[PDB]
Amino acid sequence: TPPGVVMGLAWTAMGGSTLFVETSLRRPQDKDAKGDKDGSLEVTGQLGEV
Amino acid sequence: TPPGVVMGLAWTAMGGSTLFVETSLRRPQDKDAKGDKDGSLEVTGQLGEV
Amino acid sequence: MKESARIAYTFARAFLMQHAPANDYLVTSHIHLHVPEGATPKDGPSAGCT
Protein backbone atom coordinates (compact mmCIF):
# COMPACT_ATOMS: atom_id res chain seq x y z
CA THR A 1 0.00 0.00 0.00
CA PRO A 2 2.21 2.91 -1.13
CA PRO A 3 0.81 6.12 0.38
CA GLY A 4 -2.47 7.28 -1.04
CA VAL A 5 -4.02 3.80 -1.20
CA VAL A 6 -5.77 1.73 1.44
CA MET A 7 -8.07 -1.26 1.75
CA GLY A 8 -11.70 -0.71 2.58
CA LEU A 9 -14.29 -3.38 3.17
CA ALA A 10 -17.32 -3.34 0.91
CA TRP A 11 -20.57 -5.29 1.00
CA THR A 12 -20.91 -6.01 -2.69
CA ALA A 13 -24.05 -7.43 -4.24
CA MET A 14 -22.80 -10.95 -3.37
CA GLY A 15 -20.45 -11.50 -0.49
CA GLY A 16 -17.92 -8.81 0.33
CA SER A 17 -14.59 -7.65 -0.99
CA THR A 18 -11.58 -5.69 0.24
CA LEU A 19 -11.90 -2.87 -2.26
CA PHE A 20 -8.78 -0.71 -2.49
CA VAL A 21 -9.49 2.98 -2.41
CA GLU A 22 -6.92 4.56 -4.73
CA THR A 23 -5.85 8.20 -4.53
CA SER A 24 -3.22 10.07 -6.44
CA LEU A 25 -2.27 13.45 -7.76
CA ARG A 26 -3.57 13.53 -11.34
CA ARG A 27 -2.33 16.81 -12.76
CA PRO A 28 0.65 18.78 -11.43
CA GLN A 29 0.06 20.84 -8.33
CA ASP A 30 1.90 23.93 -9.58
CA LYS A 31 -0.71 25.71 -11.76
CA ASP A 32 0.82 28.73 -10.05
CA ALA A 33 3.03 29.02 -6.98
CA LYS A 34 0.94 32.06 -5.95
CA GLY A 35 -2.34 30.51 -7.16
CA ASP A 36 -5.13 30.20 -4.60
CA LYS A 37 -7.05 27.79 -6.85
CA ASP A 38 -8.72 24.84 -5.19
CA GLY A 39 -7.72 21.28 -5.74
CA SER A 40 -11.04 20.42 -7.33
CA LEU A 41 -11.49 16.67 -7.18
CA GLU A 42 -12.56 14.38 -10.03
CA VAL A 43 -14.08 11.22 -8.62
CA THR A 44 -14.30 8.27 -10.99
CA GLY A 45 -15.46 4.71 -10.85
CA GLN A 46 -19.05 5.23 -12.07
CA LEU A 47 -19.99 7.96 -9.66
CA GLY A 48 -23.56 7.86 -8.44
CA GLU A 49 -25.50 10.93 -7.51
CA VAL A 50 -25.21 9.91 -3.86
CA THR B 1 -23.56 19.97 19.02
CA PRO B 2 -20.09 21.66 18.77
CA PRO B 3 -19.86 25.04 16.98
CA GLY B 4 -21.50 25.35 13.63
CA VAL B 5 -24.13 22.63 13.94
CA VAL B 6 -27.79 22.74 14.96
CA MET B 7 -30.67 20.30 14.94
CA GLY B 8 -33.77 20.88 12.89
CA LEU B 9 -37.17 19.24 12.79
CA ALA B 10 -38.50 17.94 9.52
CA TRP B 11 -41.86 16.60 8.37
CA THR B 12 -40.82 13.59 6.36
CA ALA B 13 -43.36 12.10 3.96
CA MET B 14 -43.50 9.23 6.47
CA GLY B 15 -43.76 10.52 10.05
CA GLY B 16 -41.55 13.16 11.65
CA SER B 17 -37.79 13.29 11.93
CA THR B 18 -35.02 15.11 13.83
CA LEU B 19 -32.34 15.59 11.18
CA PHE B 20 -29.24 17.59 12.08
CA VAL B 21 -27.62 20.38 10.07
CA GLU B 22 -23.88 20.93 9.84
CA THR B 23 -21.50 23.52 8.51
CA SER B 24 -17.78 23.95 8.11
CA LEU B 25 -15.04 26.06 6.68
CA ARG B 26 -13.78 24.80 3.33
CA ARG B 27 -10.62 26.82 2.57
CA PRO B 28 -8.13 28.74 4.68
CA GLN B 29 -9.82 31.95 5.69
CA ASP B 30 -6.82 34.28 5.27
CA LYS B 31 -5.37 33.66 1.80
CA ASP B 32 -5.42 37.47 1.56
CA ALA B 33 -6.21 39.31 4.79
CA LYS B 34 -7.43 42.32 2.77
CA GLY B 35 -8.65 40.27 -0.22
CA ASP B 36 -12.09 41.33 -1.43
CA LYS B 37 -13.52 38.03 -2.64
CA ASP B 38 -16.82 36.33 -1.97
CA GLY B 39 -17.36 34.02 0.97
CA SER B 40 -19.20 31.65 -1.34
CA LEU B 41 -21.51 29.01 0.05
CA GLU B 42 -21.34 25.45 -1.19
CA VAL B 43 -24.51 23.69 -0.13
CA THR B 44 -24.99 19.94 -0.55
CA GLY B 45 -27.57 17.29 0.23
CA GLN B 46 -29.50 16.77 -3.04
CA LEU B 47 -31.40 20.00 -2.61
CA GLY B 48 -34.16 20.89 -5.00
CA GLU B 49 -34.15 24.36 -6.52
CA VAL B 50 -36.98 25.45 -4.22
CA MET C 1 -7.87 16.79 -22.32
CA LYS C 2 -7.40 20.09 -20.54
CA GLU C 3 -5.79 18.10 -17.76
CA SER C 4 -3.66 16.30 -20.35
CA ALA C 5 -3.03 19.69 -21.93
CA ARG C 6 -1.40 21.25 -18.93
CA ILE C 7 0.23 17.87 -18.18
CA ALA C 8 1.82 17.92 -21.62
CA TYR C 9 2.71 21.60 -21.38
CA THR C 10 4.32 20.95 -18.00
CA PHE C 11 6.16 17.77 -18.90
CA ALA C 12 7.30 19.35 -22.18
CA ARG C 13 8.72 22.32 -20.29
CA ALA C 14 10.43 19.94 -17.90
CA PHE C 15 11.84 17.70 -20.62
CA LEU C 16 13.16 20.64 -22.60
CA MET C 17 14.90 22.22 -19.63
CA GLN C 18 16.20 18.73 -18.80
CA HIS C 19 17.76 18.25 -22.24
CA ALA C 20 18.56 21.57 -24.03
CA PRO C 21 19.04 24.32 -21.40
CA ALA C 22 20.06 27.01 -23.91
CA ASN C 23 16.59 26.90 -25.50
CA ASP C 24 13.84 28.91 -23.81
CA TYR C 25 10.85 28.21 -26.03
CA LEU C 26 8.34 26.32 -23.88
CA VAL C 27 9.48 28.06 -20.69
CA THR C 28 8.82 31.43 -22.42
CA SER C 29 6.96 31.28 -25.73
CA HIS C 30 3.21 31.38 -26.25
CA ILE C 31 1.94 28.43 -28.28
CA HIS C 32 -1.35 27.82 -30.01
CA LEU C 33 -2.08 24.11 -30.45
CA HIS C 34 -4.80 22.10 -32.16
CA VAL C 35 -5.64 18.37 -32.05
CA PRO C 36 -8.12 16.94 -34.63
CA GLU C 37 -11.42 15.81 -33.19
CA GLY C 38 -13.13 12.46 -33.68
CA ALA C 39 -11.85 10.04 -31.08
CA THR C 40 -14.02 9.37 -28.05
CA PRO C 41 -12.90 11.57 -25.11
CA LYS C 42 -12.33 8.57 -22.82
CA ASP C 43 -9.51 7.29 -25.06
CA GLY C 44 -8.25 10.84 -25.58
CA PRO C 45 -5.43 10.55 -23.00
CA SER C 46 -3.78 8.12 -25.43
CA ALA C 47 -3.09 11.11 -27.68
CA GLY C 48 -1.22 13.00 -24.93
CA CYS C 49 2.18 11.50 -25.65
CA THR C 50 1.76 12.71 -29.23
C46 is annotated as an active-site residue: yes
Chains that touch B (3 or more CB pairs under 8 A): A
Calpha distance C19→C13 (Å, rounded): 10
Experimental method: cryo-EM
Q: Report the amino acid identity of residue A45.
A: G
> Contact A28/C3, CB-based, under 8 Å?
no
Residue of C1, C2, C3, C13 best to disrupt the A interface, most CBs of A under 10 A: C3
Length of chain A equals 50
Collapsing DSSP to helix, strand or coil, C49 comes out as helix
Collapsing DSSP to helix, strand or coil, A5 comes out as strand
How far from B32 is each of A28, B35, B37, CA to CA, in Å? 24, 5, 9
φ/ψ (deg, to 5) at B22: -135, 155
DSSP letter assigned to residue B13:
S
Q: CA dihedral in degrees (A38, A44, A50, B2; nearest 10)?
A: -40
